[PDB]
Amino acid sequence: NGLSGRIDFHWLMLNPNDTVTFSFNGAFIAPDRASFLRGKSMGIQSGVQVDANC
Amino acid sequence: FGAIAGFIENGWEGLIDGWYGFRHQNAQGEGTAADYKSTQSAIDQITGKLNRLIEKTNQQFELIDNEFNEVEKQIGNVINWTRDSITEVWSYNAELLVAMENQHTIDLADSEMDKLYERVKRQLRENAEEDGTGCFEIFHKCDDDCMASIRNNTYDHSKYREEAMQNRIQ
Numbered sequence: 642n643g644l645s646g647r648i649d650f651h652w653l654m655l656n657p658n659d660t661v662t663f664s665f666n667g668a669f670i671a672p673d674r675a676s677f678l679r680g681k682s683m684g685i686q687s688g689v690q691v692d693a694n695c
Numbered sequence: 696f697g698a699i700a701g702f703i704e705n706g707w708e709g710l711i712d713g714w715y716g717f718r719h720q721n722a723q724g725e726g727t728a729a730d731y732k733s734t735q736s737a738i739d740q741i742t743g744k745l746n747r748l749i750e751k752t753n754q755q756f757e758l759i760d761n762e763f764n765e766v767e768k769q770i771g772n773v774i775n776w777t778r779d780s781i782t783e784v785w786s787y788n789a790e791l792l793v794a795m796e797n798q799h800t801i802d803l804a805d806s807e808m809d810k811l812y813e814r815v816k817r818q819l820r821e822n823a824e825e826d827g828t829g830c831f832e833i834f835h836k837c838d839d840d841c842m843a844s845i846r847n848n849t850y851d852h853s854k855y856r857e858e859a860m861q862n863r864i865q
């Protein structure tokens with residue numbers, strides 16, 4: 642994409658009733674909002690179209 | 696059991712209205728009848744096996760691989776080892792379950808054939824003998840109305856008992 646520098650994105654999982662801590666002074670891509678899983682579903686893969694009436 | 700493709704020489708392509716049927720002859724003619732119980736008890740079994748295998752499972756499994764952004768190689772040769780060995784198992788049971796439920800299906804036709812044959816062999820009692828191709832040689836008179844009494848199992852053995860014991864020994 643015209644850029645040679647990179648951004649390697651990490652992640653962890655914060656349990657309910659706990660915290661996270663960052664100490665830094667550089668090369669940081671900050672988070673604004675953290676996801677919260679809603680419940681149960683399923684992901685798949687396909688390379689075709691969908692149908693809804695079946 | 697020897698019935699189908701044993702001592703009966705063959706089956707009857709005209710018997711639309713059953714798996715099993717009757718076919719007689721007398722001073723009137725020849726007619727192809729059918730037998731409901733013997734046909735129906737066999738239908739109960741072919742579709743019983745059917746209602747089993749339709750029972751599916753309530754255990755769900757997730758997509759664990761990836762064919763877009765591929766996973767690691769040392770693990771692919773282990774998942775493609777477990778999956779390609781589960782493939783080899785259900786390809787063994789479908790090799791064995793399908794091979795057996797068919798093996799067990801034709802024999803339910805030779806035991807439903809020795810069960811209709813050794814019964815008419817008991818209503819007639821001591822009034823007929825068996826020739827060779829699978830028939831009962833009647834040596835007395837039995838017409839269209841008499842045959843239908845052996846069909847619905849109301850034939851009485853002491854009703855024609857003295858005639859056939861006089862035309863069989865002579």
Ligand SMILES: *[C@@H]1O[C@H](CO)[C@@H](O)[C@H](O)[C@H]1NC(C)=O
Nearest residue numbers: 655656657658659660661677
């Ligand atoms: C969370 O932590 C607080 C204090 O640490 C405690 O009073 C509370 O019972 C915990 N659980 C929930 C569900 O808030």
